[PDB]
Amino acid sequence: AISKNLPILKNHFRKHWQERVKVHFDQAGKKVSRRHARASKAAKIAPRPLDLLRPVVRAPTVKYNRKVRAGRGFTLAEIKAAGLTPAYARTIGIAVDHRRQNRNQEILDLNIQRLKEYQSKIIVFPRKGKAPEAEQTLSAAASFPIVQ
Amino acid sequence: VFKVSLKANKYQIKKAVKELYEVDVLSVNTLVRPNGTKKAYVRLTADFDALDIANRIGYI
Amino acid sequence: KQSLDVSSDRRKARKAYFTAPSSERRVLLSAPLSKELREQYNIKALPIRKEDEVLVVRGSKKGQEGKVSSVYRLKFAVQVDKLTKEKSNGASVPTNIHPSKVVITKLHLDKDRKALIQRKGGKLE
Amino acid sequence: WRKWNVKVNQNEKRYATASAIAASAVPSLVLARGHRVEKVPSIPLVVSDDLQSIQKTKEAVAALKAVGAHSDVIKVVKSKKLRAGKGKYRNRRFTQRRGPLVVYSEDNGVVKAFRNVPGVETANVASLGLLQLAPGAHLGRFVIWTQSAFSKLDQ
Amino acid sequence: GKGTPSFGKRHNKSHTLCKRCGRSSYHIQKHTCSSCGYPAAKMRSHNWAAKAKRRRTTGTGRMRYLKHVSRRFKNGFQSGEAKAQ
Amino acid sequence: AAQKSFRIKQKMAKAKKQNRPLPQWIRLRTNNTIRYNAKRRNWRRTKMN
Amino acid sequence: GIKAYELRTKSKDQLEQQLVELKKELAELKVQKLSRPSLPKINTVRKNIARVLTVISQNQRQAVRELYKGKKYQPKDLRAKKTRALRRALTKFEASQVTEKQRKKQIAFPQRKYAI
Amino acid sequence: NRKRPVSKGATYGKPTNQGVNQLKYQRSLRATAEERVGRRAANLRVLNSYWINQDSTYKYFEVILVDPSHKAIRRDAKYNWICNPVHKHREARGLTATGKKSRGINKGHKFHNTQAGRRKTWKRQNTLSLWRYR
RNA sequence: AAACUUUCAACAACGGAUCUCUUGGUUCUCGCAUCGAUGAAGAACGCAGCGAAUUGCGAUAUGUAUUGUGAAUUGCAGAUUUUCGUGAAUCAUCAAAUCUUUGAACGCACAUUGCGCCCUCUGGUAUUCCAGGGGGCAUGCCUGUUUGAGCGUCAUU
């Protein structure tokens, strides 16, 4: 045991690891099933996008604060200002996130405009009868990217 | 002398013999064969000849 | 191949064939139909059946023809009248023949053979 | 969990592809790696995009016939034989060589048309992999390009 | 004579025919199968016994019912009958 | 034994009838390998229960 | 021998008589069986007995269904065997049944479609 | 406490595990009550329980149980969920309230070593995960 | 010199290597979610014209019904004409049934084909006895049910 100027490897195989080995041969074939299930959503959903429209948010910490990023959902401030309800925002595919709060006017404007551009770019199908479709754009994030 | 179904009492036989052949059974003696089927040995009363009723049923 | 609901696996195919049930086997025992008949019926090949009418085309028995007693779906063969080995004792045994050799020349007609033909895309009876 | 798939550097791979598409030119490289390309009127063999239209196999073979293959398509036909292995009983029962490779930019049935022809591996330029361009790691598969594809290599 | 002669004295039966697995492994001075732990309700079976799962699982036997569920699932638990074409 | 149980006699009744050889007409079946019966139990050689 | 569709028409008293006619012929056969090497007739006649018995039962059971049609609690054999799980698990009425709060909510806010 | 059964205290093994006595069954007393009534009242489905009383000898627990067979439940959607087959013996699996505490299932930093599930996170983080390309 | 021993040949043994095969495995991927008191899994004994095993099934026993297919099955024997047909088949399918004795196993037992009791019907002079046919009788818990129990406790003659 031990040896020549050779660095101290810490390796963790003293337990029965060879029972719990997981090799992702699937990887390549899983992808398929994801692509295929994303498509099956898109047909099932039909005109809508696969994704709900998500807001912009500044990542936490010293390390990442400089970066901006896509958060969970939109806040009952940013929605109310953009002129709708959280109850209804959900029906039009805006991610509402109750538990985020809003202490930066220069982030809200980023979002409020983002909601205003969304409510613009989408059309809503009347519930009553006619549904004049204009294809599906599959992602919101495609059409509404998080430019820093 | 019959082969009989297992799960068949000596009453059940007497009745079936009497019912099929319109015979008066004096007395049944069953047994169970090593092969694993019952075998009745049914006696008919004085009046009924076994010999004729044997060629009546079929087996001479 | 192109679809994903079909196998280039030999090992599976052979299993299927040798284990296939009579219902399937009937199909696998198609004989082609003659150069004469094909023009009449527009049908290259039918499943071979009990009434036979058949010119053997490959083997020692090629040229010779006949009717048939029985299709041996269990040996995938079709026994044929006249086409016989003779054992040393003088008794006559039927030769086995695989149908795709054998060529049908005077089909047996039935509602269900007509219907099959009409279903397969065949003019006339 | 033994290492089956082996990572390669994207860049190395490209290098190697490029370097295979070098070899697609130069007859010397192409003639060594099989290919009856003595009847052909010089290589970097591009063909019009009229072949790109082709629908049926009959017309695709008729293109190759007149272009300068057929010495290659006879190759892949005569060459077929049983494997010399147990691989016979693992779904590799027969072998046969690689014929040319029809690169193209666009598909209006080329893929379908060449499909059944026993040598011809079609392939997009978009992909154009070293598995198809330098098989057996023998540089210089005889590529039949299209006027579209061959234009698109610069891009 | 702990051997050939004391084997002589082997002429009884610790065990007999267990109801439940028809093994000759029904102890009697204990009233219970060593094999299948009848008359207790579960089958006396263990993980450590890898093979002796294999010797008695679903499929070792007939599966008079369960041979034919897969079908009934596949046809979607139909009821009634077919008619004609 | 003589003074036997019925669940015993029934299992012997099985094992008497089982012991009989391979009936010579299976030998002629198409796709048959069974030249002779393996499962065949002389009363001395091998016991039962 | 006997065809199902021919039995289906016959009455309950007719079938019992028919069954007895077969069970005699079966009996006379098994007497002839022991005096002859091969007796293959026996198989087809033993099917008939079944044919009949099946036809008898099938009529009986459709007739029981005929009485219990409508009312709750038909006999266990005349419910759908399905598979315990399903036969226990909530019926498409139940589960889809939604509390009155959640009904309202749905009506005011159903997932409206929307492009782009 | 739980007494480690072992004949006579003969634990056999590393003196660490010679401990027989001061030993504390990790499922509460609440749960054990819910569990014991579960097996008694097999048709019922435990829903929750609550403490009543105790003394020297015993804790006492009032256990509330619900009948998924019964219709008043099965129809009315407020309870109807409990009739699903993934609530058969919630008490045994530790899907009861006591169960989830005793499993150590809160959010946060004070509950890493169990959160999804103790034997889960372990079996996630005691796994060698190998890709195609390594 | 022969015999013998040894070596080596051809031919012959023994033996089953090698080669070639391959309805088996094998790992990998994908899809699905479906046992059981409506008796599961398992077992036992049976059942085929000629079966010992296997395969299938349960006294309707290598099957019945239904549907499809459209003439087989095939070792022999054998039918049956059903072969311009509501129809061959060790065919597929499968939604109707049968499903012996068991088995969680459930009347109580169970090294026993033991021992009951109840309802109903048919035999024997029969409400009670015997016998035969049918249908029952497990435990827990749950919701109700009726019948009750406790000066636990309220209000009345």
From Swiss-Prot, chain B:
Family of the protein in this entry: Belongs to the universal ribosomal protein uL23 family.
Protein name (record): Large ribosomal subunit protein uL23
Organism: Kluyveromyces lactis (strain ATCC 8585 / CBS 2359 / DSM 70799 / NBRC 1267 / NRRL Y-1140 / WM37)
Gene designation: RPL25
Shown residues within the full chain: 83 to 142 of 142
From Swiss-Prot, chain F:
Keyword set, alphabetical order: Cytoplasm, Ribonucleoprotein, Ribosomal protein
Annotated source species: Saccharomyces cerevisiae (strain ATCC 204508 / S288c)
Location of the protein in the cell: Cytoplasm
Region entry Disordered, spans: 1-21
Role summary: Component of the ribosome, a large ribonucleoprotein complex responsible for the synthesis of proteins in the cell. The small ribosomal subunit (SSU) binds messenger RNAs (mRNAs) and translates the encoded message by selecting cognate aminoacyl-transfer RNA (tRNA) molecules. The large subunit (LSU) contains the ribosomal catalytic site termed the peptidyl transferase center (PTC), which catalyzes the formation of peptide bonds, thereby polymerizing the amino acids delivered by tRNAs into a polypeptide chain.
Composition skew (Basic residues), residue ranges: 6-19
Domain of life according to the entry: Eukaryota
Name recorded for this polypeptide: Large ribosomal subunit protein eL39
Subunit structure of this chain's protein: Component of the large ribosomal subunit (LSU). Mature yeast ribosomes consist of a small (40S) and a large (60S) subunit. The 40S small subunit contains 1 molecule of ribosomal RNA (18S rRNA) and 33 different proteins (encoded by 57 genes). The large 60S subunit contains 3 rRNA molecules (25S, 5.8S and 5S rRNA) and 46 different proteins (encoded by 81 genes). eL39 interacts with YIH1.
Any one Gene Ontology BP term: cytoplasmic translation
Gene Ontology MF annotations: structural constituent of ribosome
